[PDB]
Amino acid sequence: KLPPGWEKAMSRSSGRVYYFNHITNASQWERPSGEPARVRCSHLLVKHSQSRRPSSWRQEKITRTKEEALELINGYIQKIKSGEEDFESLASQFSDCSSAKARGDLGAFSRGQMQKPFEDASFALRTGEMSGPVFTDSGIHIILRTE
């Protein structure tokens, strides 16, 4: 069974089986379940000192390490998954991209247009699904596929 990228693994914490996707870095307890020319996604970006351009609208010189960036990402994913905050609200407020202004929505794109890790993750996530941490030269993303 299992769609592209989805595999089974063992939880070291709990000793129950979970499901992870090596392409999108999603993980969940529940069993998940062609490829369209285009998809639509929003995304929240946390840059770090090793980013391509270590600057954003929020912060002219970004100094946080890639480890700190990753902790921030993990926190946001925790808050989104718990329902304490929704995706759009955190992108608007905290994304290190100007796409923040549009609730992190980047519009529709096909393969061949975006940074490959971002693309691969976007095309593996079904409408409504959200990635784990996704690493590009811009920094670390959370991705939501909206169409």
From Swiss-Prot:
Q: From which domain of life does this come?
A: Eukaryota
Record flagged with keyword Glycosyltransferase = no
Tissue expression as described in the entry = Expressed in immune cells in the lung (at protein level). The phosphorylated form at Ser-55 is expressed in normal breast tissue cells but not in breast cancer cells.
Can you summarize the PTM annotation of this record? Phosphorylation at Ser-55 by DAPK1 results in inhibition of its catalytic activity, nuclear localization, and its ability to induce centrosome amplification, chromosome instability and cell transformation. Ser-55 is dephosphorylated upon IL33-stimulation of dendritic cells.
Q: What residues bear Phosphoserine in this entry?
A: 55, 92
Q: Which reaction does it catalyse?
A: [protein]-peptidylproline (omega=180) = [protein]-peptidylproline (omega=0)
Q: What are the BP-aspect GO terms?
A: cellular response to hypoxia; negative regulation of amyloid-beta formation; negative regulation of cell motility; negative regulation of ERK1 and ERK2 cascade; negative regulation of protein binding; negative regulation of protein catabolic process; negative regulation of SMAD protein signal transduction; negative regulation of transforming growth factor beta receptor signaling pathway
Q: Which SUPFAM superfamilies match?
A: FKBP-like (SSF54534), WW domain (SSF51045)
Gene Ontology terms, MF aspect: beta-catenin binding; cis-trans isomerase activity; cytoskeletal motor activity; GTPase activating protein binding; mitogen-activated protein kinase kinase binding; peptidyl-prolyl cis-trans isomerase activity; phosphoprotein binding; phosphoserine residue binding
Task: Identify the keywords attached in UniProt to this record, alphabetized.
Answer: Acetylation, Cell cycle, Cytoplasm, Isomerase, Nucleus, Phosphoprotein, Rotamase
Checking SMART domains in the record gives:
WW (SM00456)
Q: PpiC domain location, by residue?
A: 36-147
Q: Where is the WW domain?
A: 1-33
Domain comment text? Answer: The WW domain is required for the interaction with STIL and KIF20B.
Q: How does it assemble?
A: Interacts with STIL. Interacts with KIF20B. Interacts with NEK6. Interacts (via WW domain) with PRKX. Interacts with BTK. Interacts (via PpiC domain) with DAPK1. Interacts with the phosphorylated form of RAF1. Interacts (via WW domain) with ATCAY; upon NGF stimulation. Interacts with PML (isoform PML-4). Interacts with BCL6. Interacts with FBXW7, disrupting FBXW7 dimerization and promoting FBXW7 autoubiquitination and degradation. Directly interacts with RBBP8/CtIP; this interaction depends upon RBBP8 phosphorylation.
* Protein's name in the database: Peptidyl-prolyl cis-trans isomerase NIMA-interacting 1
Species of provenance: Homo sapiens (Human)
